[PDB]
Design a binder for this molecule. Structure first.
Ligand SMILES: *[C@@H]1O[C@H](CO)[C@@H](O[C@@H]2O[C@H](CO)[C@@H](O[C@@H]3O[C@H](CO)[C@@H](O)[C@H](O)[C@@H]3O)[C@H](O)[C@H]2NC(C)=O)[C@H](O)[C@H]1NC(C)=O
Ligand SMILES: *[C@@H]1O[C@H](CO)[C@@H](O[C@@H]2O[C@H](CO)[C@@H](O)[C@H](O)[C@H]2NC(C)=O)[C@H](O)[C@H]1NC(C)=O
Length: 308
């Protein structure tokens, strides 16, 4: 919509009063100057076609710990702790998907360090939606099953790191300088001397509800979920987020990596795709148990097929 800032000092003071200090909002952080049009661009979920996940008796009746972190449970899987940067696209549906697929190749696929190409998925799955104008996480995982995806060695993400800060500590260029269209779908690597290797799942499925989410995470590792983004979330700095003010900005896809309790408040730990400058080093904590902003309404996951 507008070139009107999403944040104001008055808006953030209201938020910090209404949230009762359970989470901290910050006006003069990395998102201070973000525009209503740029904020809505980050939120690329539009629009089940996947079968519902079925647990065995042993999976369903296992006593889950009160704390869990995917990076500590699989300390030899180096993709889990890495933070993506979707850049100036509505590519979150594809970026969260490709991140969790990279992680599952190590947790289940016998491959320690492969990065699945978000670019390949964004550009070639026309059935998933319309690239940087948004798309459907469930269709992304169905595409990983039927067609498959190259690694980011074959097809690196086309859009560079960008900052919303004036002086980025990482020295990234501003995101205000960029506004990207869906890349072309290619059938060779960007360097055609790198041979094409196709990576597939043998099964893809849907999840619903706190219990399903914790069991899937514990047994199989990170997966893709989505929630409603309101203006207050843009200002998130630390603590367990819950919505208290601001208008609806769209659906956003993210990567669930953990859960815990912080001073009696249950949370999910989540890897965002807005680089390591935003939130808690690229992470946020959100309230678990009550489907906060619909986060527990729909997850998408799958089992990578081991190569050869
Ligand atoms: C499929 O292959 C094409 C290569 O033909 C990729 O599109 C190209 O993407 C690169 C970035 O990776 C673009 O480079 C940029 O050029 C602009 C000028 O328009 C400039 O602002 C930047 O400095 C940057 O270097 C290039 O424009 C673009 N070319 C074409 C013909 O589309 C595409 O990204 C590949 N798709 C995937 C999914 O990998
Ligand atoms: C948001 O933009 C404002 C200005 O529009 C930035 O504040 C200025 O930053 C310059 C460097 O670019 C400083 O030298 C000035 O002291 C600041 N001027 C004013 C008028 O405040 C601000 O840094 C931007 N915020 C973020 C976090 O990027």
């Amino acid at each position: 919509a507008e070139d009107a800032p999403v944040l104001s000092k008055a808006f953030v003071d209201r938020v910090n009063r209404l949230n009762r200090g359970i989470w901290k909002a910050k006006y003069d952080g990395v998102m201070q100057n973000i525009t209503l049009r740029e904020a809505k661009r980050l939120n690329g979920v539009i629009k089940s076609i996947l079968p519902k996940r079925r647990f065995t008796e042993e999976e369903a009746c296992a006593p889950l710990p009160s704390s869990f972190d995917s990076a500590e449970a699989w300390p030899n899987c180096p993709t889990i702790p890495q933070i993506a940067d979707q850049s100036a696209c509505g590519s979150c549906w594809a970026v969260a998907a490709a991140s969790a697929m990279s992680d599952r190749f190590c947790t289940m696929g016998g491959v320690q360090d492969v990065h699945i190409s978000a670019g390949d998925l964004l550009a070639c799955c026309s059935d998933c939606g319309d690239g940087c104008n948004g798309g459907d996480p469930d269709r992304a995982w169905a595409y990983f099953s039927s067609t498959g995806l190259v690694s980011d060695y074959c097809q690196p993400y086309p859009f560079p790191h960008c900052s919303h800060h004036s002086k980025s500590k990482n020295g990234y260029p501003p995101c205000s300088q960029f506004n990207f269209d869906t890349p072309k779908c290619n059938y060779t690597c960007d360097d055609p001397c790198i041979p094409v290797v196709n990576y597939r799942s043998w099964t893809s499925y849907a999840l619903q509800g706190e219990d399903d989410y914790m069991r899937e995470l514990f047994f199989r590792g990170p997966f893709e979920v989505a929630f409603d983004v309101y203006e207050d979330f843009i200002a998130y700095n630390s603590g367990v987020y819950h919505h208290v003010s601001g208008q609806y900005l769209g659906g956003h896809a993210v990567r669930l990596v953990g859960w815990g309790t912080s001073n009696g408040v249950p949370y999910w730990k989540i890897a965002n795709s807005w680089n390591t400058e935003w939130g808690m080093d690229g992470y946020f904590l959100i309230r678990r148990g009550s489907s906060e902003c619909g986060i527990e309404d729909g997850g998408s996951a799958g089992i990578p097929l081991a190569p050869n």
